[model samples]
Target: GRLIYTAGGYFRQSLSYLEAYNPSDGTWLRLADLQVPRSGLAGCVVGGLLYAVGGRNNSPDGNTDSSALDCYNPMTNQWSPCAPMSVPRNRIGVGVIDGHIYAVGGSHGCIHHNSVERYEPERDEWHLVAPMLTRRIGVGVAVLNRLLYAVGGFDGTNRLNSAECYYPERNEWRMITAMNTIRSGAGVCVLHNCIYAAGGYDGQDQLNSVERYDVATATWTFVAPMKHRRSALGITVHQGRIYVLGGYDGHTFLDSVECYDPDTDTWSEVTRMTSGRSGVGVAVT
Candidate 1:
């Protein structure tokens, strides 16, 4: 069975709810809680371990940024701590390539960052890398053809439509063709040699538009819009389809779910989650 796990998120504040979706049955099952509740985080599966990256904790007590990295072992049904990032980051981008996890641009309070870091599991350490040209917050990142792509995001001054990719071998980032529309908190994933950028906030309004970047042509083209507007949604590819989970719709937090089929270029609503949430971290384990 294919199971996709959605980690901590924000409904009203930060949350530690962990839920798993079974695509075969279209059902959601509750899972173990995260060690620390968070929002604005990113997740990815590396060597069968689910790694939850930097985010912020907005508690009633006070607001705190997290540099903590947690790893989940499904067999143990528990989360364990790993080396944290040097600086705290929220609304960050994460991707895995060449057996290392990359933590990209994000903000720590008023300071938006262009800094990037890499985590080595064996050594359990984080090392600084080349920073991106733009200081991004809520950037959508994915690994495609061994290159790490950072999509649309907020650059402190404005929401961006620009995109770029990092070449691991040269330790450098190169600009790519920008998207059709500016986006922040968009869902991004790699499918069929193309990187898809889904619904997000476009500065003016919540978005439902979807676009894909062609690896070969280095161009972004519009595909189809989703059923409803979403930002801070959790997205992943499963069974040849793109699944977009809960996010905010400008006014309300959402528990709704929708999916897209590239073959048909259409989107269909799927089973909703148990609770409304945004800033969720999702990964297939």
Candidate 2:
């Protein structure tokens, strides 16, 4: 499932349907539906257009990878198809800069993909761009000072602790720093100059550990642990703090929520989601 934030609320979607959760009222409101049922798709809002791209029609039997682009117009509460991607992807990672959508590393079922593509709305096109040094799925992506960074995820064979950054102007990708522990499906968000990566699978077990990366010094610092262990956690930087949402904890899906304060380097519990969900998407408007 993919997630997004809008004037309506924090929207959660899977299998062609969408729902909105109003934080102010703490209530969920059902929204519009998609033409195709897809999970592990990448989505983002640019110029008032909400777009979902490249996912499997069926779940992990996902040789069924698709390049179909579906778009939503809030004003009309209707969704339509946009141009297809140049590559088929599932568990795709997306980053937006200067009004352009950048599709990052994703799996092509058989192997992890490193080829990166850029999507332009005006042209309705996808252009092959610089590829990442590492191939990954469920990779956490964020933008800091206009540079795109990819965080830890499943690297096909094992979980990863490594991270990399992309300089769009240079069309280059360079390995930066690696995390303290190998993890997959971690939640990542940028707060000021630091990028925080939280809770993921460590191959043998789910983890509650968290860490932060400082771009200025190019170093990683271990941060306070969270209240719950999670993998495939959805992360977002909303208002001032980093919100870590629903995922799996090995036993069952998670509904507990946690928020981190950059100033204090601490975490606190927040309102739980109405239902437990795993491998779902999270985004900030």
Candidate 3:
């Protein structure tokens, strides 16, 4: 399995790939780096391609936005620009379903957006889909059993715990289970038929807690907490295990990584990332 990640920041932009780790041996190998360096971008792996979409460059005062869609082929370790999105966005949620990639709520400049779009790689085009119920940024989007689940993000002034589901067949948005703690900058992924949401800022503080949501029952349950509190981290499921990557912990950015095992309900340290970062994007290749 391959895990691709994007790191966003004010000074520079960069992307890194974390090869599958063997928990038994505790080793890691680096893969190819991204062509462009920018942060607040959305990322997802579809049909063996890794797509990095939308993000800004430079600090708030010097900010520059991009609707640029870049795709990476692991086989050749090369990147090429895809058809640009209709709207320039950053900090959006993205997922792939039915062979198409969906870009969900994010922002253009400082305005939060509720719009959604789907990319058709075969045709090299994009199509508008149902918009999200609420405006959000820094959201986590994951597909579970062909259904798209968009969860926890910030809505300009406040952190949010609200979660929603989008059914492509019906082309509609429906609210589902809400998280116990309101947060943004959280990491989300599906593993063993359950959705795991973890580590984010709750406005006033960074969090070390973890929670799991069962879609069948629409309920959330507390899970094992992380060794450190972090936000804007990258998460992905590889080799039947969940890996948490770089992010900020209020005072500083982090390069530390950890893995969670559902079978044992325990957390273990993994090989650290190459650099400390916050607002990173990640996907498994």
Candidate 4:
């Protein structure tokens, strides 16, 4: 978890709590709660708002899920419900640009979907965009070089290394270079104009391997791996460092956190969470 002190705060998302991690020199302040109790919920910040999108309210094997789109405004300390998607899914790839939130490939009731939808907060509506090229869940998505990306995920039958990008202007998705490994539940984040994919399950094993994507050349290169192997981890960039939080390792859930320094190409453990947690989400503002 990222340290917050002196009137500052950060979001640590979990099924049991909608926690705001904050610390202070003179005081501590607690904010509002998450709208839903979920696991592996996909979310992002667009312009001035925070979104908690599709996520399962039930167990990993349970069929009940949610597609409710909830928004939180720190500026006003207010909350509102936005347009819900046509499908209730979990583990969807999400990207937000120009006040538009894209919810991509995810699963519903154990069935995979390639459908892509965009939510417009101003209009309070959802529009069906072009579908993804593949039906997948657990994919890593990010915006790079003015384009939207849908990265590796499980395709029902196999774990995929293949990737694709969406051109919003064209309303279409095209295939891109595959990653070096077939994996799912990896943390994907962009830092210094490079896309980083780290710590995921590779079908047979929970992975500690990490890789970087150079969008210009459309290729992936290996980087130093994390100390722990995990999947379903939450990741984001803060102060130019990549913060990777909890996930499952086939044996147990984890709440350990780590950070990566691109300048040094190294990984180091950070503060551990209060308890073992997986399918967690992290947000830094």
How would you encode candidate 1's per-residue C-alpha lDDT over 1-285 as one tens digit per residue?
A: 868899999987899988889989888888789988999999898888899999999998898989999998888888999999999989999999988999999889999899999999989999999999899999999998899999999999999999999999999999999999999999999999999999999999999999999999988889989988999999999888999999999998999889899999999988888989999999997
TM-score of each: 0.98, 0.88, 0.91, 0.89
Number of the predicted model whose lDDT against the real structure is largest = 1
Q: Give candidate 3 regions above 4 Å deviation.
A: 1-32, 59-61
Q: What lDDT does each candidate get?
A: 0.92, 0.76, 0.80, 0.76
For model 1, which pairs clash? none
Q: Global CA lDDT of candidate 2, please?
A: 0.76
Worst 10 residues of 4 by lDDT: 2-11
Ranking by lDDT: 1, 3, 4, 2
* Model 4: residues with Cα > 4 Å off, grouped in runs: 1-14, 21-30, 59-63, 76-78
lDDT of 2 by residue, 15-117 (tens): 5555554445655555687776666666677887777767666644333766777777767888888888887877777788898888887777687888889
Provide C-alpha RMSD values for all models, in order.
Answer: 0.8, 3.8, 2.4, 4.2
Write the residue-wise lDDT of candidate 3 on 1-285 in tens digits.
Answer: 344444343223443332433445655555465556667777788788878888766543466677888887777767789999999878877888988999988889888888999999999999899998988888888899888988888888878999999999999999988999887878888987778888988889989899988988899898999998998888888889888987889887888788999989999888776667777677776
**Which residue runs does candidate 2 get wrong by more than 4 Å?**
1-14, 59-63
What is the lDDT, from 0 to 100, of the residue 167 in candidate 1? 94
Worst 10 residues of 3 by lDDT: 9-18
